[PDB]
């Protein structure tokens, strides 16, 4: 026993001293003060965080709220901020979301950056514009088979100002739902029998948010309209879970109470003074509609447009006396649609198959300079893959054509 | 004076006679859209419609305000498009004697022109697309400025002609260009020229450079790379003296000024010789009965860098000033990598043929192998006199590094910098399509 | 004058501790894409080296050594103890002191300190010097030796690397299989100094 | 009751730690000890002739038949002391108890001598059978360690064992080759005058020579390395006056 | 008619067709014969005449005399070797015992003294060819099978690896030893990276090494440089280490070796490696051509004479290679091998005119180092060189590093 | 659940795809036995070391985490050195200095920190017997390859006959040296990765 005494007391003496020289190199080498983040120029009005911390929350910490998705960690890649004077340095994400790109002005992704050292931002004021709502539902109803149209209410009568091609975030709690709550109606219970679609179920425990496209042009006041596309499981795994957003926007009927994001912005119509051609499918109605109407409407131009929508029946077809009121008085405006397998219920006598078939044999087949006319397309990954190979082999830029992927 | 040691006068048979005879009359003209570099036209023609001389033709998308305009008068024929409807050419059938005209000027008035004066009728005469800008070799902007401008008054390319021959026929008219230059510059003008003695200007920032040696030296990249380093921060814009030639009959008589020189030369040309021709005429009717019997190609330009002008590209191109024809080699020789030649050029020492000094070879148009990888053996050191490291630098080109590439000097180089390391190569790489793979990727990233 | 030279040559090249001790391949292998970054790495190695090797000897032959402290006891139990907090310590003040006061030195080469902060190379360093005995002036010349022969070896490596960019591998084999393979190839190059007794 | 939280947490964890590793370490001292006895006292007894197996025939016949001594090299007679835990290894280190020597008397690369060793005297009855004598030289990628059994009449060898030693696994490595190492019964180590006189031959030695022993094939720079220990530790410095000593008797 | 032949088949090779599993080895036999009869495609209309494979046949046609000396070589020292031990009756029960020495005297050759340089070719010949033809075989089959699975043609450069690696090895060498050692030089050195020009080592080098390490008796010692049974002899490396330039002794003649013995070759070792005169001869005309380097060369040379004069200046007692002069290090061992065909690879070697220099100083440096001061191995030509393959890179980044601050001052 | 256990072995291997562990694999492995006991002690120590970590995950000082976490590592790996001198005195000094080298063993402090910290006890138990199982996968084939084709000997036991022993084999000398493990761990991923393509990495 004379020597595991002295093993334990120099082992204690020897991990304390360790210790305790750790701690007293730390008390006297590490700053800790005061850290100002100042933006946009320089009205003194800055945020004041101490140097252990995170930017963007640093930032979403005082009224900044800037593009997010996955609550962090960089996988959609918008929170992009000017970096004046901060940290210099490129991190993995910014290879992968603003791959190379040079930013040599200093634009880097918010998420990665290191508040410890003094910060100096750059910020445009639209970030400073964005707003959280509490809006009720008006209606929520089929407009197809698998879309349903949620329409929210802005409260106090004032409205959101957004611009065509806009999308906002839709904010849902931890809850429970269970689809045969849902408001499908005799015309479009057909498939959903089929499936035996009635028998799935979800719930999260988990604050989400994903992010929804208006379809009502800015002009027209305290609406947000929106189409949603429920996201079942797949056919070939039908066991995995099914989408949790999609399916919880579903639940909700007149009465309820939703929480949205400010405008945020991407996917723009610019002016040219070119030819529109727009090509949609799917649930793309959303930002087709806000850009065919933004052009008639309020900006009242004499640009040559045109709407190619490509659906499976016409029973899928909606908002199609909308467009028609539109392209009756204003003879600088076409559409057309094209159903693939459409059933002998329907009786169609316009155009089948696929749009990119549809619109080159018909339009662009015969067109006199098909590279000088503008494309905006949303829709599914099948058909916005289709129709950019279709284009390239006409000689259309990739400035040209403006697409809007769902994320997805 | 600077004196270039490594590089390589081709031996071939055909050499012209510099003696500047008269041409065939061209009856149809073209402008070449695939030789403009990161060029997407918008069309401002149709077929069938007449035009007159510098008359837009197209325009430039990712250039705004550069217009393209017609070499001549008369009816375009036909608008030539190819995979994924690429813009190929568009013929103009030459008829009439209708042109537009533009502002004329005294000899003494042009050194004091203003500099934007002098753009806005350039680019309206479209005489614009003669220059063009070291790094990545584009038509420049039409806000931009460069402090550096160079022209070549000398061609060491084989079988090319001398312009010393051509520059004592319009004296003047050089002498009025180089001080329309003097006057669009914020720098100097290097006119870049052999021992012999040109036409001067008596302007303080014109100043003569003198060059010798064999061909690496002919070419814009070496000058700029001896006299003005070029880099992202700096560029330099290169013409030619024909160019210049040009700019001064523009602004001294109010028209555009579109003859040439070439030089119809080749192993299988009968009379080779200077012939005057106009800008964008055709090869095909322009070689018609100066060709031997037998399978040739036609080129425009060099042997080292040029266009197989075939079908809707047998047009003369926009900065080409020769045009060589040669047979094509198709034969098939039993253990002919391993028999003696001496009829066989090389810049190695393998074959018999440089031990009889003064040779001149029938080349054809044959590959003298297979496509292999690269085994360095050392030939791209003696035909680069660059401060460069080649055989790294061509690596990184070969792999697909762009930034390694930057770092070793692309940004200096052009595809006629590395048609000699292409064309001593034992692997049979081309190496002016990977480098201009490289200049797309950097031009985009950045 | 002459002891400390065959010492240097010696953990430089006759036993190098990259390739012929196959101490610190976690890093040797994951870390040698660039050669600036190997250098960076192979001189954080070489200080961190040469600054702990000289402590624990010191810290051994003081207190851990048997008879060292009181007659009788040994206390020998506690040597990886020791060491390992030792350099753990080492490592994090040094990365605190420059990161506060050098912030040149701190983006050169603490970035490279977070790794090199439990390493096989530095934990072998001291135990080796353990099994030989080594003096003072002798524990900071086989330090210094040590560190630089493992950083020629990863500059090397990441030469060989870097020329590799013009090769075809097979897809199994990108990566760590041509790595490995390769840094076999180097241990074959460096077994010339075998049968050297120096 | 943060700092306190802190040094309370590592102190009570380096307790428990240090508890556990002092109450481990202390406790096994013995058995290590004895685990590293037993290896040597097998080569021992193998090189001895005696056959055993197992840690009780091992001691059991190690304390009955073996009688370690230690042996003045200089004088070449027994020295006091408990020869049982004596380390020559480690006395030849420490400059109080070695010597350092010449490059003409270093033959076989020591480099240092201890001033006393060990040696085991193996016992039958009461009379000495043999005695086993520890040799180590200097081979071309190590330094071989050996025992050798040498007769009571002083030049017969009756067994050879290498113990240690780093040579190529099958071209020096062929010092622990039982065919090679049963060549050594027989020998004679001194001739008449008294002399080193084993010869390592290279290319075969002949059949029936007393002094001549079979050279390794592929390897004359190990083989060298065995000839220049044996020809140093037969030499004065080394076992000579302990050989001739014992030739004359008193054993 | 063998051209008309090769072009009603080539349907058969391309794709679609029935045989197009074994495109690459009709492509390897088409374009041996005939030249592919291909024209350019862009944009440089005219090409050199050089190629790859009149690069590797010039280096594979100047190791002929060095081939031929070697099999003159080896059966002149066996035959020496045999008459000094046996003679009689004895000798005729060791010459019916051996193959090698009974088929030499079937095909007209004698085993006796007095026989003409014809005999003792026809055993270095049967000595020889047994080796090369089974390292061809065993490493075409890699090659093809690695061409084939990765649907490549076949580069070149396999002519000059396994005549190399036949020649660099002592003539009593078993069989499957050299297949194994082929295989790995093919395969894990060269193959495995891509092919030709895509590796970083010597394959050749790197065959022998692993022969050197794993088989280390069958490549060492005093048994196999003479292809005679029941000879032991040293070879002069290793005479002069044990004695210096007295120990110089011909055992199977009792002749000493002088300076011209080691320069013509008269002299054991590997079979192709003894002539100094024949490999230069070729050297020579593989320098004049502009394939091999003369500054890697002369680096070699250079650091060769510094550290053997270094060694002879500063001295020593007990070691007697320090007396070895820089003109008994260039004819002794394969010291002019490597360096005139082995060290000159284009592929292993820098790629740059300033790292060139260096890097054969550097093999030079290190042979002269592994010959003096490292008492196992009596050369070190094969590690030196295989040392030094690991750094060419970094000298050529040095200098590339240097090259790029030049550009950064606007003045290059 | 068994997936915890197995999922090291083939579909995330520590020397294979997260490499970490490879300076021991690359020196224990010429004897089988060694392979074993090396196998055995990692296993041990892992699985003893997340245990415990995770015990305390909650009440350690983020400051002195490293010192904590190594206190824990090294008194288990010094009660191991200990009972491996009693018990295995023959392994124990063929382990040179890789029995003490378990602590910058890169597998134990990665599954410490990654996975301990953030679990419960039970769960951080298997994850390190799994990554064990893992680690001495590797270690066990390379052992195999290496003690048999070097010295035709598996275990100790004589499975090829030596030509100097009287047998056909000739032993294989690089085996017992230091490249071959690297061309065996090489060969090795290149069978893993051609099996399962998941793994292979991208095209640059
Ligand atoms: C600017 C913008 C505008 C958008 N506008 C719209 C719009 O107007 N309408 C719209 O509907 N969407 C829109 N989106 C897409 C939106 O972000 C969501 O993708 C969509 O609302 C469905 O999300 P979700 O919660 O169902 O996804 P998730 O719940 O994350 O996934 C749903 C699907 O994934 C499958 N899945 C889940 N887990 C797995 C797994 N482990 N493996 C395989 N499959 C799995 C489910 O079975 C289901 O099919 C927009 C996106 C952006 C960026
Ligand atoms: C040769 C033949 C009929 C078929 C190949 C099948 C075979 C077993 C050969 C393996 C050796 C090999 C791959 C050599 C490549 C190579 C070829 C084919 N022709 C060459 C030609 C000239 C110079 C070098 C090479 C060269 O180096
Ligand atoms: C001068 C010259 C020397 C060569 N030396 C070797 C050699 O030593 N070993 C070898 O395997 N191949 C050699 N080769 C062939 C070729 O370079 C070799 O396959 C490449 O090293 C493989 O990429 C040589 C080729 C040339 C032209
Ligand atoms: S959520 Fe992906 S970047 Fe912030
Ligand atoms: S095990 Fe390789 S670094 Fe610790
Ligand atoms: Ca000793």
């Keep these: 026993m004379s020597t595991i005494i002295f093993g334990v007391v120099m082992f204690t003496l020897i991990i304390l001293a360790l210790v305790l020289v750790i701690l007293f190199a730390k008390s006297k080498l590490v700053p800790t003060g005061d850290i100002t983040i100042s933006i946009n120029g320089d009205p003194e009005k800055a945020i004041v965080t101490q140097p252990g911390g995170k930017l963007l929350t640093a930032l979403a910490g005082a009224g900044v709220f800037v593009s997010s998705a996955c609550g962090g960690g960089g996988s959609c890649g918008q929170c992009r901020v000017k970096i004046k004077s901060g940290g210099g340095d490129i991190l993995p994400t910014e290879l992968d979301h603003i791959s190379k790109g040079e930013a040599r002005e200093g634009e880097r992704l918010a998420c990665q950056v290191a508040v410890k050292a003094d910060m100096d931002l ?81 719930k999260v425990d988990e604050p989400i948010i994903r992010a929804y496209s208006m379809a009502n042009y800015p002009e027209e006041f305290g609406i947000i309209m929106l189409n949603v596309r429920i996201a079942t499981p797949p056919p070939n795994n039908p066991n995995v879970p099914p989408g949790q957003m999609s399916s919880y926007i579903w639940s909700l009927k007149a009465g309820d109470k939703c929480t949205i994001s400010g405008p945020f912005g991407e996917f723009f119509a610019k002016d040219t003074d070119a030819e529109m051609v727009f090509i949609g499918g799917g649930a793309g109605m959303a930002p087709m509609r806000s850009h065919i109407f933004d052009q008639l409407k309020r900006l009242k131009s004499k640009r040559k447009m045109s709407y190619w929508y490509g659906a499976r029946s016409k029973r899928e077809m909606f908002y199609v006396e909308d467009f028609d009121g539109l392209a009756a008085e204003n003879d600088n405006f076409v559409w057309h649609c094209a159903l693939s397998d459409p059933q002998p219920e329907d009786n169609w006598t316009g155009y089948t198959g696929f749009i990119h078939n549809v619109l080159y044999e018909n339009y662009l087949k015969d067109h006199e300079a098909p590279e000088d006319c503008e494309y905006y397309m949303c829709g599914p990954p099948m058909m916005n893959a289709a129709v950019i190979n279709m284009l390239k082999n006409l000689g259309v830029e990739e400035e040209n054509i403006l697409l809007d992927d769902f994320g997805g | 004076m600077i004196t270039i040691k490594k590089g390589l006068d081709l031996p071939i048979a055909g050499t012209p006679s510099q003696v500047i005879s008269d041409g065939k009359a061209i009856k149809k003209v073209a402008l070449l859209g695939e030789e403009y570099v990161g060029m997407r036209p918008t069309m401002h ?175 814009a990249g070496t000058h700029m790379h001896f006299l003005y380093p070029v880099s992202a921060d700096h560029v330099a814009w290169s013409i030619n003296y024909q160019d210049v030639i040009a700019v001064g009959q523009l602004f001294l008589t109010g028209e555009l000024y579109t003859q040439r020189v070439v030089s119809l030369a080749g192993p299988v040309v009968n009379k080779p010789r200077l012939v005057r021709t106009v800008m964008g005429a055709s090869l095909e009717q322009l070689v018609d009965s100066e060709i031997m019997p037998g399978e040739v190609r036609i080129i425009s330009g060099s042997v080292l860098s040029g266009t197989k002008a075939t079908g809707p590209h047998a047009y003369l191109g926009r900065y080409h000033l020769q045009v060589s024809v040669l047979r094509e080699g198709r034969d098939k020789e039993l253990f002919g990598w391993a028999m003696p030649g001496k009829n066989k050029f090389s810049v190695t020492r393998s074959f018999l043929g440089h031990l009889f000094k003064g040779q001149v070879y029938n080349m054809t148009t044959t590959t003298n192998g297979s496509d292999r990888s690269m085994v360095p053996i050392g030939n791209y050191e003696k035909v680069m006199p660059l401060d460069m490291e080649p055989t790294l630098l061509l690596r990184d080109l070969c792999a697909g590094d762009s930034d390694s590439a930057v770092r070793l000097g692309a940004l200096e180089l052009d595809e006629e910098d590395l048609a000699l390391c292409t064309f001593v190569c034992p692997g049979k790489y081309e190496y002016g399509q990977l480098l201009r793979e490289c200049l797309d990727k950097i031009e985009k990233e950045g | 004058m002459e002891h400390y030279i065959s010492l240097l040559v010696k953990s430089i090249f006759i036993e190098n501790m990259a390739l012929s001790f196959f101490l610190g391949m976690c890093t040797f292998l994951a870390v040698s894409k660039k050669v600036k970054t190997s250098f960076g790495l192979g001189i954080a190695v070489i200080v961190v080296l040469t600054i702990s090797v000289p402590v624990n000897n010191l810290v051994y032959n003081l207190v851990l050594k048997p008879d060292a402290l009181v007659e009788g006891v040994d206390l020998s139990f506690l040597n990886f103890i020791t060491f390992i907090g030792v ?112 | 009751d943060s700092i306190k939280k802190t040094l309370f947490v590592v102190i009570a964890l380096s307790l428990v730690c240090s508890i556990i590793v002092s109450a481990a370490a202390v406790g096994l001292r013995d058995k290590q000890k004895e685990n590293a006895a037993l ?71 020591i480099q240092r001598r201890a001033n006393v060793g060990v040696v085991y005297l193996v016992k039958d009855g009461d009379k000495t059978s043999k005695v086993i004598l520890p040799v180590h030289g200097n081979g071309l990628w190590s330094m071989m360690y050996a025992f050798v059994a040498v007769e009571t009449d002083g030049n017969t060898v009756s067994g050879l064992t290498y113990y240690e030693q780093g040579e190529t696994p099958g071209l020096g490595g062929e010092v622990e080759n039982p065919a090679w190492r049963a060549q050594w019964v027989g020998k004679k180590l001194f001739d008449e005058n008294h002399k080193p006189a084993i010869k390592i031959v290279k290319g075969g030695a002949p059949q029936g020579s007393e002094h001549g022993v079979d050279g390794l094939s592929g390897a004359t720079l190990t083989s060298n390395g065995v000839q220049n220990t044996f020809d140093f530790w037969l030499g004065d410095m080394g076992f000579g006056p302990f050989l001739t000593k014992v030739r004359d008797g008193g054993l | 008619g063998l051209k008309k032949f090769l072009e009603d088949i080539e349907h058969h090779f391309e794709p679609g067709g029935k045989h197009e599993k074994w495109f690459a080895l009709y492509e390897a036999a088409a374009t041996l014969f005939y030249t592919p009869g291909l024209v350019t495609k862009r944009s440089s209309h005219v090409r050199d005449s050089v190629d790859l494979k009149r690069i590797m046949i010039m280096v594979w046609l100047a190791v002929f005399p060095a081939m031929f000396w070697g099999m003159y070589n080896a059966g002149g020292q066996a035959i ?125 080098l790197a065959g022998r090494a692993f022969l050197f390490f794993a088989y280390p008796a069958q490549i060492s010692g005093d048994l196999v440089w003479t292809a005679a049974d029941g000879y032991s002899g040293a070879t002069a490396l290793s005479q002069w280490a044990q004695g210096g330039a007295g120990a110089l002794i011909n055992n199977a003649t009792g002749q000493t070796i002088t300076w011209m013995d080691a320069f013509i070759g008269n002299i054991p070792g590997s079979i192709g490696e003894v002539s100094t005169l024949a490999l230069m001869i070729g050297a020579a005309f593989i320098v004049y051509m502009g394939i091999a380097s003369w500054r890697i060369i002369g680096g070699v040379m250079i650091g060769m004479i510094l550290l053997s004069t270094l060694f002879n200046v500063i001295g020593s007692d007990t070691n007697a290679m320090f007396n070895m002069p820089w003109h008994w290090h260039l004819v002794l061992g394969g010291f002019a091998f490597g360096m005139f065909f082995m060290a000159t690879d284009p592929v292993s070697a820098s790629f740059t005119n300033s790292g060139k220099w260096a890097y054969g100083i550097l093999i030079g440096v290190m042979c002269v180092l592994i010959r003096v001061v490292n008492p196992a191995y009596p050369e070190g030509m094969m590690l030196a060189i295989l040392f030094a393959n690991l750094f060419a890179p970094l000298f050529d980044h040095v200098v590339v590093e240097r090259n790029i601050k030049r550009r950064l001052a606007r003045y290059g | ?177 230091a490249p071959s493990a690297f061309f065996l761990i090489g060969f090795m991923i290149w069978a893993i990765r051609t099996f399962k393509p998941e793994q292979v990495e991208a095209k640059e």
């Excluded at chain 1, 149209?149 to 849902?172: N, T």
């Excluded at chain 2, 069938?48 to 001389?53: L, Q, R, T």
């Excluded at chain 5, 005549?163 to 499957?176: D, E, N």
């Excluded at chain 6, 195999?144 to 598996?154: H, Q």
């Design chain 1, 122 to 202: 750059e910020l445009p004021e639209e970030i400073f514009g964005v707003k959280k709502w509490e809006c009720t539902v008006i209606s929520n109803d089929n407009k197809a088979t698998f879309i349903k149209e949620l329409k929210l209410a802005i409260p106090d009568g004032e409205s959101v100002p957004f611009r065509a091609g806009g999308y906002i975030q839709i904010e849902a709690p931890a809850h429970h739902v269970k689809y045969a709550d849902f408001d499908v109606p005799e015309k479009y219970r057909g498939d959903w029998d089929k499936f035996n679609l009635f028998r799935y179920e979800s």
């Design chain 5, 80 to 204: 020496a070797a045999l008459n000094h031990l046996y003679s009689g009756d004895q000798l005729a029960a060791i010459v019916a015992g051996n193959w090698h020495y009974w088929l030499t005297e079937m095909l007209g050759g004698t085993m006796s003294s007095d026989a003409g340089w014809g005999s003792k070719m026809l055993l270095g010949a049967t000595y020889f060819l047994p080796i090369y033809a089974t390292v061809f075989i065993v490493g075409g089959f890699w090659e093809v099978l690695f061409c084939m699975v990765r649907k490549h043609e076949v580069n070149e450069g396999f002519f000059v690896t396994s005549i190399l690696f036949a020649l660099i090895v002592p003539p009593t060498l078993p069989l499957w030893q050299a297949a194994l050692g082929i295989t790995f030089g093919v395969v894990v050195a060269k193959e495995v990276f891509g092919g030709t020009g895509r590796n970083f080592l010597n394959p050749a």
């Design chain 4, 39 to 109: 290896d040597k006292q097998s080569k021992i007894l193998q090189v001895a002739g005696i056959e055993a197996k197992g840690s009780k025939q091992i001691v059991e016949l190690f304390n009955k038949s073996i009688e370690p001594r230690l042996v003045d090299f200089n004088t070449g007679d027994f020295v006091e002391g408990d020869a049982a835990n004596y380390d020559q290894r480690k006395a030849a280190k420490e400059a109080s108890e070695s010597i350092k020597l010449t490059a003409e008397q270093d033959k076989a690369k």
């Design chain 2, 45 to 219: 023609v149709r077929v069938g419609d007449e035009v007159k001389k510098a008359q837009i033709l197209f325009e430039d998308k990712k250039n705004p305000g550069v217009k393209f305009t017609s070499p001549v008068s008369g009816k375009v024929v036909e608008i030539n498009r190819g995979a994924k409807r690429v813009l190929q050419s568009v013929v103009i059938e030459v008829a009439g004697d209708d042109q537009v005209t533009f502002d004329k000027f005294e000899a003494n008035q042009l050194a004091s022109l203003n500099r934007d004066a002098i753009k806005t009728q350039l680019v309206e005469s479209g005489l614009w697309t003669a220059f063009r800008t070291r790094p990545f070799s584009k038509v420049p902007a039409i806000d931009s400025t460069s402090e550096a401008i160079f022209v070549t008054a000398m061609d060491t390319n084989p079988l090319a002609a001398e312009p010393t021959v051509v520059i004592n026929e319009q004296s003047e008219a050089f002498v009025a260009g180089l001080d329309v230059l003097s006057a669009l510059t914020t720098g100097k003008v290097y006119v870049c020229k052999k021992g012999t003695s040109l036409p001067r200007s008596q302007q303080p920032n014109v100043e003569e450079h003198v060059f010798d040696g064999p061909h690496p030296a002919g070419l």
């Design chain 3, 87 to 198: 350099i753990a310590a080492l490592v994090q003040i040094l990365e605190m002191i420059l990161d506060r006061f050098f912030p040149p030195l701190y983006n050169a080469l603490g970035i490279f300190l977070p790794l090199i902060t439990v390493n096989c190379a530095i934990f072998g360093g001291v135990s080796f010097m353990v099994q030989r005995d080594y003096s003072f002036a002798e524990s900071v010349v086989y330090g210094f030796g040590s560190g630089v022969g493992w950083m020629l070896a990863i500059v090397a490596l990441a030469g060989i690397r870097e020329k590799m960019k013009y090769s075809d591998v097979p897809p199994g084999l990108r990566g760590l299989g041509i790595t490995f393979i390769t840094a076999g190839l180097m241990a074959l190059g460096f077994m010339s100094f075998s049968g050297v007794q120096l």
């Design chain 6, 1 to 177: 659940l068994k997936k915890s256990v197995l999922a090291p072995v083939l579909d995330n291997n520590p020397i294979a795809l997260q490499v970490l562990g490879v300076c021991s694999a690359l020196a224990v492995t010429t004897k089988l036995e060694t392979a074993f006991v090396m196998t055995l002690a990692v296993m041990f120590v892992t699985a003893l070391s997340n245990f415990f970590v995770s015990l305390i995950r909650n009440h350690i000082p983020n400051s002195v985490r490293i010192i904590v976490q190594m206190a824990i590592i090294a008194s288990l790996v010094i009660v191991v050195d200990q009972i491996l001198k009693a018990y295995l005195y023959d392994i124990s000094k063929q382990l040179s200095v890789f029995v003490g080298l378990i602590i910058t063993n890169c597998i134990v402090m990665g599954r410490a920190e990654a996975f301990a910290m953030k679990s419960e006890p039970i769960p951080s138990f298997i994850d390190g017997i799994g990554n064990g199982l893992g680690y001495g996968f590797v270690l066990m084939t390379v052992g195999f390859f290496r003690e048999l084709l070097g010295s035709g000997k598996l275990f100790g036991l004589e499975v090829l006959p030596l030509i100097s022993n009287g047998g056909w084999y000739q032993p294989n000398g690089l085996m017992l040296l």
